[PDB]
Design a protein around this ligand. Structure first.
Ligand SMILES: OC[C@H]1O[C@@H](O[C@H]2[C@H](O)[C@@H](O)[C@H](O[C@H]3[C@H](O)[C@@H](O)[C@H](O[C@H]4[C@H](O)[C@@H](O)[C@H](O[C@H]5[C@H](O)[C@@H](O)[C@@H](O)O[C@@H]5CO)O[C@@H]4CO)O[C@@H]3CO)O[C@@H]2CO)[C@H](O)[C@@H](O)[C@@H]1O
Ligand SMILES: OC[C@H]1O[C@@H](O[C@H]2[C@H](O)[C@@H](O)[C@H](O[C@H]3[C@H](O)[C@@H](O)[C@H](O[C@H]4[C@H](O)[C@@H](O)[C@H](O[C@H]5[C@H](O)[C@@H](O)[C@H](O)O[C@@H]5CO)O[C@@H]4CO)O[C@@H]3CO)O[C@@H]2CO)[C@H](O)[C@@H](O)[C@@H]1O
Length: 180
């Protein structure tokens, strides 16, 4: 997409959980299940505000525990998240370090979703004792997502991807250039 970001509506991803998604990089939180997405897909960099992932909804499915490859299941439920946040390259080299020159992370995944624990998404997705997975995602209509957006936290905040057709398309728009 514009900026060199790798923004595909479906693919393979890794998955983790995180705490504290109430003041996220898109500039609005939401009450439903939410995630951060890796920088190369988010469409912005730290401090630059919303990227084009903001507000888009994705169905996530885990099917592998990369730390325990002998585990065959059960996995969690498929969940629908709204992307509200950025998982930056900086400080997240294992999972969110995809760049235009090296577009997969240390698990070979071209995307990563960090699922917010606060609002319940991670408890639906991660079995007890298996807090990091790999699997698939596919962008869906936000008709498939339960929840309500929070208020703007700063000027330029954006979740307009929530009413956009799936990628390829533009809603909030990308900021600057993807990490190289
Ligand atoms: O940077 C992105 C994001 O990260 C968030 O933290 C992540 C973190 O990055 C990730 O490394 C971490 O991964 C955990 C994982 O959650 C956990 O399930 C896994 O547990 C393993 C355990 O280490 C193994 O020892 C055990 O092996 C057993 C075998 O399963 C069994 O068959 C037998 O052989 O016995 C073995 C030994 O007991 O299996 C467990 C399950 O696979 O360990 C991983 C590495 O620590 O997950 C976290 C949370 O998602 C972070 O919160 C966020 O802020 C950040 O943005
Ligand atoms: O008034 C001056 C100027 O302001 C502009 O608006 C600014 C606003 O002032 C800033 O506060 C705001 O800052 C946001 C950053 O742009 C955004 O990148 C950052 O995103 C964070 C996110 O908050 C955080 O949750 C996330 O953590 C991840 C890490 O991987 C781990 O720490 C965690 O465990 O897991 C998560 C997910 O993986 O990190 C990201 C990236 O660091 O959030 C900031 C606060 O929301 O930027 C605004 C835009 O520049 C205003 O537009 C101008 O008009 C005005 O002049």
């Amino acid at each position: 997409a514009t900026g060199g970001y790798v923004q595909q509506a479906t693919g393979q991803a890794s998955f983790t959980m995180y705490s504290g998604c109430g003041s996220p990089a898109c500039g609005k939180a939401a009450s439903g299940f939410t995630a951060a997405i890796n920088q190369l897909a988010f469409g912005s960099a730290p401090g630059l505000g919303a990227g084009d992932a903001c507000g888009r909804c994705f169905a996530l499915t885990g099917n592998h525990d990369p730390y325990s490859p002998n585990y065959t299941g059960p996995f969690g439920q498929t969940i629908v998240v709204k992307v509200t946040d950025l998982c930056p390259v900086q400080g997240n080299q294992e999972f969110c370090g995809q760049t235009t020159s090296n577009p997969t992370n240390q698990h070979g995944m071209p995307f990563h979703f960090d699922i917010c624990e606060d609002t319940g998404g991670s408890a639906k997705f991660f079995p007890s004792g298996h807090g990091a997975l790999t699997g698939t995602f596919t962008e869906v209509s936000c008709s498939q997502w339960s929840g309500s957006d929070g208020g703007q936290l700063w000027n330029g905040a954006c979740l307009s991807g929530e009413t956009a057709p799936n990628w390829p398309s533009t809603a909030c728009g990308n900021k600057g250039t993807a990490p190289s």
